[PDB]
């Protein structure tokens, strides 16, 4: 039974921060952003160089990579 | 102390930096 | 093995050790002055016919001297 | 950059030049073993083939052998590999008998009936006296361990 | 070297010398049928045994016969 | 992405009274009786009666449609018996001192005798696959569950019949519908492997944890809720397991520890059962899951996300490989053959692995109880993973014979592979005599060394000793596992490496499995029999195309018997010939494995623990010092353990001593089609046609001989049923003589 | 190996003979024969 | 539909019904008269 | 024996010790267009624009490769041309020894390994005993 | 000269072999490569 902590504002910002990194990786690295579905406000996303995939995708990538932090973390006790 | 066995594993791992370097110094010959 | 397996198999298996043996260090110096060849299908089926002979006398020659002087002398 | 070529330039020779069958190494081994060595006599390169061969038969049967739980222990390797350098010299003046008996050129000394027959004599006299170097080795095995680690100097 | 014998009976449909792989065979001319023609085995030194040209005669029971003999480098196919 | 073709075929009768006319070989009519065999040989090939791709496709899905039929009408034959034809009811009561028995046997001929004493007053076979298991892993109860998966499974294989139906006559996909397989892989692993296995981890989360923790607790199954009382009442389910009070908001907030009460990777077996914990199988299932359903976003599909097979592929070359795999993304999606080569490969190798762990890790309650269901499921899987690692053998020789044009691949891997087939078929050639050599020629050492009085030169763990060192640090490696290189194991992954005798209701369960120089010996036999039998199907796919004897290979097709006489006798030189002597290696190799198996387990881990701690085997002890000569395979192992097949004639066991004998006969029939030629039984069969003819019964389909791969074929098949029969008799026969 | 009959060294010098020198003088020369001109 | 009467008459189905009913009949009279040895 | 060889990456199917100690065969077509064969030692090759000269150690691969040059490509090429070429130096000519291939009738040939008679009529072996001779060739 | 060591005759077969088989390996091959050609 691995430590983990429940809920906080801590576990909040690190998956928002993960979901960042998980930005900055899907946008230096997938090859077709803009294919796909089309998407309200792409100007918003990467100037209309980005689609719904892209959003579920990247963002997605976020939660497992905050999964890992969130658990790696708290299994090791710093979060 | 140390093991019997470890030295030879020592011994079979740094074959491969000779191997390496064996292929480096000659590599540089050219 | 000789009644089942029959030559063109054991020949295309052999022409792929003569090339092991024609290709290697040092072994490139012994050659063969008859070329090695499967046997012959008519050759094989004797073969095994002779192996199945052999076998099956032997065996039965062990089985029948050993059961009766087993419990006869 | 790639490594496997075909064999000397011929790409219809049945042989890739691959890294371990035509590499810089493999030339200046392969073609620098005694078999292959250029300007030696057979005799020499029948000696050195030979004194490999003798050295290395001692020990299987010295090790793994009917007499290797009892005193004669090395004797019976020795007895082993004389039997067997016996036989492999036997079957390679027979194999110089048969297959050099029709006229053939002198492109390498090694393939021809004088060339094999030197390389048979040599192989002989180099396989006896590896064997016998190797059984004068481990009957004295007591001399080596005290003058390699200095129990005498 | 195997022997490769035509009959009488050969209706010349060609069959057998273009199922042969070494090409051993070849037509001739000939007046005894309707096609005027009838295999020949010129190149039969060639020949390996394998009997394709047996097994595409369809006249019955065969116009063309191979009879196994003396093998030879050329009639064993060895690339070796 | 979805296209198809509207009612491509009518649905009508008047094909079925025609036979032959898929093929246009046949839709002549019958001339002679090599007619049937033609018949029924050309019936599948699916591929050679049309050349489309396309329509071949279209017969290919509605033939899988079909076949899911056939499965799900068995599958409810299973529930069924076990349903109504069983003591399931009874044995769920007692599962210490009565076995499963899901079939009776109508008394006709005095085989009513079959319906031996199995316990609780019910008569019956004692089945020996692990169905009660399964169903009590499961969470069954009752038998009206069981009869109700029957009805269900009976309703789905109709389902299948009309989707194949349908998928054939009314609405055919097209083509592209089949080429995309990165949209099939997702669907694949997201929806069919991955949310397969969230299902089973959700059911048994909801089902099977709570009906077998009560099971465990020493509830009868007449007073265990219905499954879907611990669903309507989560509190009983809080009863059990506390981490229920808290709902999902622990999940959805990554909240996970608080689920190690029933989510735990404890390791081990279950000491009550004998089966794995459904603990840690509950949470294997949901690790499964996550990982499919991750790994089921790989591929792009209709969206720009994924990551395409093409340039993957094309991604990979080497020096060594010049020009890579990119020419292999045409292959395996213009060819239903050399998809069928790695899917035969990779699901045989997948049947052997679940042979070889569910021995090890018994993942049913009371499996390691009764040593009649893992003999016999580490058999039958073993045999199903072999014929269809030789069926992989038999579709990469057809691929290169039929679907490889060398046209769309120059110099990538395929082509470097025929390249070179001469070095790889000798190199393997090699390790084959070197292992056979110094596998079996230890056997032959010891078994001379034994009979000529001198045992101390043996290769004996009391002798010469060749200890399998590398399989003993691995061993050593997964004893200390749980401690330092997992450290929330809280126990061994199996005792087959290392720990304590599980012993329960006085059986071993299991208990590590030591390798001594016996050990090393049987595991170099079956590197030696794998490689041969990969050696023969390696050889057959790669001089499918053409040899050096026979350099028209290709055109003559998969199927022939021969070139010719010349050459010295061309007789096997086709890829189908490889196929049919790799079936003979592979009955060779498992058949070593098995005994081997039923050995090892008969002498070093099956047997009874006495309360005194101590632990008597079934063979006791035999493995150590017979199993080094060939007379000790044949002594202690074939002769001593058939005496429980051969003197139960007139009791319940006599089915497997006639099935027994059966094989043997069979076996020895198939020598006849194996020695034997064409030309023999086509001279026989015209004296034969001259007795008939005499008196004016001559047939007018003309009684051809088989031909000649149709006698291959048959010989081969009836060896392999014989042996396979004979070997199922002896281990369903021992087993039930043991416990 | 004791020999109780007579001339028990007789089988001594025979086995060998007979188990080697039979075997490799013969196919020594058959060796040498068929494979001869 | 003379489709179903085409197959229904092929030889393996008339062969199986025959062998069915054969068998159904050698079965009923085991069933019935068990153990006749002889006469 | 002119030709440049084929774009072949070479293979370990091909000529062995045969060929330089005896005949090895040497298959040689003239295409304009390149394209991609089947070698019988096995893989795939390319056919250089003009004139190629493939040296094998069979007849057999060397008429397997001329009967897929015929029948596996749409501008069939049939002006392939086997030689028997020695170690010594001396090429025969083999394949088309005539004008035209051996399916045609060239009118100019002879008939030879031809029978006056049908198989019935063979000689049977006990009129022919120890005659040095068999059935077929009295 | 005793080892108390793990590996005790590693040592024995190493100062032989970097003491001679190293300097009379590597001296022949540079004698043979340095007067080559
Ligand atoms: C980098 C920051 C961070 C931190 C500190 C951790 C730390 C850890 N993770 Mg984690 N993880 C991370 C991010 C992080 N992770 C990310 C971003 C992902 C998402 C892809 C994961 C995915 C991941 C999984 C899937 C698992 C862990 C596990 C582990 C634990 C042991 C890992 C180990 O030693 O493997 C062992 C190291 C080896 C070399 C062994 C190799 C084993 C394979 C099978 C061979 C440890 C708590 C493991 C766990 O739950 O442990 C409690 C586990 O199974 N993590
Ligand atoms: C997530 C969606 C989904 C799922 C669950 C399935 C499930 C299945 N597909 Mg399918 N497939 C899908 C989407 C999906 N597919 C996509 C999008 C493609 C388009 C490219 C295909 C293309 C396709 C073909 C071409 C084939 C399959 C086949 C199969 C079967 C595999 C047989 C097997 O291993 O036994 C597992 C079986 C089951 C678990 C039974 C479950 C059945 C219910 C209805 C679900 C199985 C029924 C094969 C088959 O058998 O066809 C009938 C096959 O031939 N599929
Ligand atoms: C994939 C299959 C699946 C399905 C269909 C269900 C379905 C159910 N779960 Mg869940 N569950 C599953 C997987 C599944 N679970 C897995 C994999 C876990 C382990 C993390 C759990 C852990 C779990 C808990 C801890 C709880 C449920 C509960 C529930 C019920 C209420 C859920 C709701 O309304 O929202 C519902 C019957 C709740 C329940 O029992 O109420 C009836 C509840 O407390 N689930
Ligand atoms: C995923 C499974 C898979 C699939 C669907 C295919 C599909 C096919 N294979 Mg097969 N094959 C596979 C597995 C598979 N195979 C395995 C595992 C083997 C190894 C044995 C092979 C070996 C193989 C060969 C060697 C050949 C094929 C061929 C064929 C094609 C036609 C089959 C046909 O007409 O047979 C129709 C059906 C039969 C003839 C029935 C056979 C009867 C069996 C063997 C005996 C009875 C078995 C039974 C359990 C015993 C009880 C019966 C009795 C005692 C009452 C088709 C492409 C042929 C082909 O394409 O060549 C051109 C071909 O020659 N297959
Ligand atoms: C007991 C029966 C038997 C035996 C001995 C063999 C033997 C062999 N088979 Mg097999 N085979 C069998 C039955 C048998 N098979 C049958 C029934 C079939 C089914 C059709 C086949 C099908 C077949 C195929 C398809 C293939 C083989 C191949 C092989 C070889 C594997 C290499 C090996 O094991 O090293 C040799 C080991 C032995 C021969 C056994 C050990 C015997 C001792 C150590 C040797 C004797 C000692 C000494 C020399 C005696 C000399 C005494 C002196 C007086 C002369 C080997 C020759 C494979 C092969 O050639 O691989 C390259 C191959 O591809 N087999
Ligand atoms: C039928 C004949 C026969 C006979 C007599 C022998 C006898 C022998 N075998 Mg052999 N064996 C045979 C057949 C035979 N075997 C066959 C067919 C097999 C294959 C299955 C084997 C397999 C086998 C193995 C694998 C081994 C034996 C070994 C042994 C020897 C055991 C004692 C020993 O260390 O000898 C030592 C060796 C010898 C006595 C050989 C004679 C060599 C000496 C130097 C005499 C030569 C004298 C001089 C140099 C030449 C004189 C010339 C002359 C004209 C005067 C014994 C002499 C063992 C052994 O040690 O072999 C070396 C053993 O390891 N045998
Ligand atoms: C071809 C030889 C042959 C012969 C002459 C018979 C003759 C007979 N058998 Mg028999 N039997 C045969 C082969 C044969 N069997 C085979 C091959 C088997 C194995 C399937 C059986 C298994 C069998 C059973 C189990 C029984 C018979 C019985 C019968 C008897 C009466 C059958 C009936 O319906 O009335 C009769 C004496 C029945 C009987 O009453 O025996 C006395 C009976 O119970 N037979
Ligand atoms: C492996 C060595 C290996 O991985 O080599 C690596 C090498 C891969 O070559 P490249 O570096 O060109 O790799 C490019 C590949 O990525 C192509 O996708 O493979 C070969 O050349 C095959 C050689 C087989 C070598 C013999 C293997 C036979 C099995 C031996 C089993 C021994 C235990
Ligand atoms: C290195 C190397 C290698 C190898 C290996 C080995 C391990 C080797 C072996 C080696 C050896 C195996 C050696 C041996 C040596 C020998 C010797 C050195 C001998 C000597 C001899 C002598 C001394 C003799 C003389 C004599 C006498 C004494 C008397 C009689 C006669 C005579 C005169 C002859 C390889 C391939 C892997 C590659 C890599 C590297
Ligand atoms: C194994 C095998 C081979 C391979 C056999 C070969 C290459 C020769 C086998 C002889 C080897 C060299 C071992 C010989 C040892 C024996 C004791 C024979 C001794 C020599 C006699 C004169 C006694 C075939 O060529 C063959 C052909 C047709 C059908 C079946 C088969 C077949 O089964
Ligand atoms: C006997 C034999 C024949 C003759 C075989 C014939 C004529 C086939 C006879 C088949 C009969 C009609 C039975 C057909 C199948 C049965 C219905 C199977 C019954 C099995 C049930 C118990 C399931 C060959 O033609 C042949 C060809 C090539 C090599 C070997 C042989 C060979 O050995
Ligand atoms: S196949 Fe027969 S009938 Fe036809 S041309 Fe040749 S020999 Fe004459
Ligand atoms: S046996 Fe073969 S090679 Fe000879 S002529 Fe007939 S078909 Fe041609
Ligand atoms: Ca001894």
Redesign the pocket.
């Known amino acids: 039974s691995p430590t983990t902590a429940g809920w906080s504002l801590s576990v909040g910002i690190i998956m928002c921060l993960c979901n960042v990194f998980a930005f900055v990786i899907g946008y230096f690295a997938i090859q077709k952003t803009g294919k796909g579905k089309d998407l309200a406000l792409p100007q918003l996303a990467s100037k209309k160089t980005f689609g719904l995939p892209e959003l579920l995708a990247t963002m997605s990538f976020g939660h497992i990579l905050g999964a890992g932090m969130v658990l790696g973390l708290a299994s090791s006790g710093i979060l | 102390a140390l093991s019997d066995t470890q030295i030879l594993a020592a011994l079979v791992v740094a074959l491969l930096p000779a191997f390496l370097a064996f292929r480096l110094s000659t590599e540089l010959y050219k | 093995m000789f009644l089942i397996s029959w030559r063109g198999y054991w020949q295309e298996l052999i022409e792929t050790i003569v090339w092991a043996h024609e290709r290697t260090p040092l072994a490139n110096l012994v050659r063969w002055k008859d070329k090695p060849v499967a046997l012959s299908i008519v050759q094989a089926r004797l073969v095994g016919l002779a192996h199945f002979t052999v076998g099956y006398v032997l065996t039965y020659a062990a089985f029948l001297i050993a059961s009766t002087a087993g419990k006869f002398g | 950059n790639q490594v496997v070529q075909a064999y000397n330039g011929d790409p219809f020779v049945g042989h890739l030049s691959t890294p371990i069958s035509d590499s810089a190494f493999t030339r200046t081994f392969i073609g620098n073993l005694p078999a292959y060595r250029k300007g030696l006599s057979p005799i020499l390169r029948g000696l050195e083939v030979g004194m490999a061969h003798g050295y290395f038969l001692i020990g299987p049967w010295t090790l793994l052998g009917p007499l290797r739980d009892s005193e004669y222990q090395y004797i019976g390797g020795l007895i082993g590999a004389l039997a067997l350098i016996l036989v492999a010299t036997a079957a390679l003046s027979s194999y110089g008998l048969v297959t050099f008996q029709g006229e053939q050129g002198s492109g390498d000394t090694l393939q021809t009936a004088d060339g094999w027959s030197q390389f048979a004599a040599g192989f002989f006299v180099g396989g006896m006296g590896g064997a016998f170097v190797a059984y004068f080795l481990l009957e004295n095995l007591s001399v080596v361990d005290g003058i390699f680690r200095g129990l005498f100097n | 070297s195997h022997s490769v014998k035509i009959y009488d009976t050969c209706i010349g449909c060609t069959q057998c010398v273009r199922a042969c792989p070494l090409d051993v065979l070849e037509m001739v001319p000939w007046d005894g049928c309707k096609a005027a023609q009838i295999a020949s085995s010129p190149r039969t030194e060639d020949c390996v045994g394998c009997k394709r040209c047996e097994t595409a005669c369809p006249t019955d029971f065969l116009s063309i016969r191979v009879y196994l003999g003396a093998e030879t480098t050329r009639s064993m196919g060895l690339a070796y | 992405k979805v296209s198809v073709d509207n009612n491509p075929v009518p649905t009508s009768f008047e094909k079925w009274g025609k036979p032959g006319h898929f093929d246009r070989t046949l839709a002549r009519g019958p001339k002679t009786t090599t007619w049937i065999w033609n018949l029924?040989?050309?019936?599948?090939?699916?591929?050679?009666q049309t050349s489309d791709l396309e329509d071949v496709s279209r017969k290919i899905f509605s033939?899988h449609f079909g076949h899911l039929a056939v499965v799900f009408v068995w599958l409810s034959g299973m529930y069924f018996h076990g349903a109504k034809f069983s003591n399931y009811e009874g044995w769920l009561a007692d599962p210490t001192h009565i076995k499963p028995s899901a079939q009776v046997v109508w008394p006709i001929v005095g085989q009513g005798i079959l319906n031996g004493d199995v316990g609780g007053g019910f008569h019956g076979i004692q089945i020996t696959s692990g169905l009660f298991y399964l169903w009590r892993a499961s969470g069954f109860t009752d038998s009206y569950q069981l009869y109700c998966t029957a009805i269900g499974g009976l309703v789905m294989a109709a389902l299948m019949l009309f989707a194949g139906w349908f998928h054939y006559h009314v609405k055919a996909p097209k083509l592209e519908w089949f080429q995309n397989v990165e949209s099939m892989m997702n669907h694949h692993l997201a929806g069919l492997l991955g949310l397969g296995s969230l299902g089973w981890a959700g059911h048994q989360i909801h089902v099977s944890m709570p009906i077998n923790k009560l099971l465990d607790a020493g509830v009868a199954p007449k007073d265990i809720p219905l499954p879907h009382e611990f669903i309507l009442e989560p509190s009983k389910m809080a009863e059990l397991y506390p981490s229920f009070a808290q709902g999902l908001t622990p999940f959805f907030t990554l909240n996970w520890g608080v689920y190690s009460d029933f989510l735990t990777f404890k390791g081990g077996l279950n000491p009550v059962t004998g089966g794995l914990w459904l603990s840690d199988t509950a949470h294997h299932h949901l690790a499964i899951a996550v990982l499919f359903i991750i790994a089921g976003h790989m591929y792009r599909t209709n969206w720009g996300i994924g990551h395409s097979m093409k340039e993957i592929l094309e991604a990979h070359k080497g020096p060594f490989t010049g020009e890579g795999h990119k020419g292999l993304y045409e292959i395996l999606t213009t060819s239903?053959?050399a998809q069928?080569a790695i899917?035969?490969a990779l699901?045989?190798s997948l049947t052997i692995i679940v042979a070889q762990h569910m021995y090890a890790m018994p993942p049913y309650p009371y499996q390691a109880i009764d040593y009649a269901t893992q003999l016999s499921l580490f058999t039958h899987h073993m045999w199903i993973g072999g014929?269809?690692i030789?069926?992989?053998?038999?579709?990469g020789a057809?691929f290169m014979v039929?679907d490889y044009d060398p046209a769309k691949n120059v110099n990538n891997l395929l082509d470097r592979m025929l390249r070179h087939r001469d070095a790889i078929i000798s190199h393997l050639n090699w390790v084959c005599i070197f292992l056979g050599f110094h596998s079996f020629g230890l056997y032959i050492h010891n078994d001379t060394m034994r009979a000529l009085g001198r045992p101390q030169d043996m290769f004996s763990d009391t002798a010469i000793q060749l200890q399998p060192i590398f399989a003993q640090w691995v061993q050593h490696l997964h004893t200390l596992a749980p401690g330092a290189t997992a450290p929330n194991a809280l126990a061994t992954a199996s005792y087959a490496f290392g720990g304590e005798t599980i012993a329960v209701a006085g059986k071993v369960a299991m208990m590590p499995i030591t390798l001594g120089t016996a050990d090393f010996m049987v595991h170099h036999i079956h590197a030696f029999t794998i490689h041969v039998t990969a050696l023969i199907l390696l050889k057959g796919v790669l001089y499918a195309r053409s040899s050096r004897l026979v350099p028209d290979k290709a055109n003559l097709?998969?199927?022939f018997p021969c070139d010719g006489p010349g050459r010295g006798g061309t007789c096997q030189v086709s890829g189908?010939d490889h196929?049919?002597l790799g079936?003979f290696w592979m009955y060779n190799s498992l058949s070593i494995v098995i005994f081997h198996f039923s050995w090892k387990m008969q002498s070093d881990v099956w047997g009874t623990v006495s309360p005194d701690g101590s632990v008597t085997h079934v063979t006791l002890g035999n493995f150590a010092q017979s199993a080094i000569t060939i007379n000790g395979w044949l002594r202690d192992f074939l002769w001593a353990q058939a005496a429980n097949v051969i003197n139960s004639y007139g009791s319940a066991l006599s089915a497997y001593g006639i099935m027994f004998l059966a094989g043997h006969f069979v076996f020895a029939f198939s020598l006849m089609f194996l020695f034997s030629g064409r030309g023999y039984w086509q001279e026989l069969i015209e004296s034969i046609v001259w007795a008939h003819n005499k008196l004016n019964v001559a047939p007018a389909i003309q009684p051809r001989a088989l031909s000649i791969i149709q006698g291959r074929?048959v010989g081969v098949?009836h060896y392999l049923?014989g042996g396979i029969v004979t070997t199922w008799a002896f281990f369903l026969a021992r087993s039930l003589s043991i416990g | 190996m004791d020999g109780s009959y007579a001339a028990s060294y007789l089988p001594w010098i025979l086995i060998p003979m007979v188990g080697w020198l039979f075997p490799a003088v013969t196919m020594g020369l058959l060796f040498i024969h068929i494979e001869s001109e | 539909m003379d489709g179903l009467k085409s197959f229904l008459s092929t030889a393996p189905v008339m062969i199986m019904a025959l062998l069915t009913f054969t068998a159904g009949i050698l079965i009923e009279f085991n069933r019935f008269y068990p153990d006749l040895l002889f006469h | 024996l002119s030709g440049q060889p084929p774009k072949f990456g070479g293979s370990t199917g091909g000529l062995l010790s045969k060929a330089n100690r005896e005949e090895k065969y040497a298959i040689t077509w003239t295409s304009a267009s390149e394209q991609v064969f089947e070698m019988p030692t096995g893989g795939a090759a390319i056919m250089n624009e003009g004139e190629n000269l493939l040296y094998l150690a069979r007849k057999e691969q060397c008429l397997a490769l001329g009967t897929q040059l015929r029948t596996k490509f749409k501008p069939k090429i049939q002006d392939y041309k086997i030689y028997r070429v020695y170690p010594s130096g001396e090429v025969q000519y083999l394949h088309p020894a005539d004008g035209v291939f051996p399916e045609k009738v060239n009118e100019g040939r002879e008939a030879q390994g031809t029978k006056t008679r049908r198989i019935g009529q063979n000689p049977e072996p006990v009129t022919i005993k120890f005659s040095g001779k068999a059935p077929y060739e009295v």
Not at chain 6, 40 to 48: G, R
Not at chain 6, 390 to 395: D, Q, S, Y
């Open positions: 029924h040989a050309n019936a599948h090939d699916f591929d050679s033939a239903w053959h069928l899917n035969l699901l045989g014929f269809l030789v069926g992989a053998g038999a579709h057809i039929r097709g998969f199927r189908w196929v049919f079936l074929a098949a049923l």
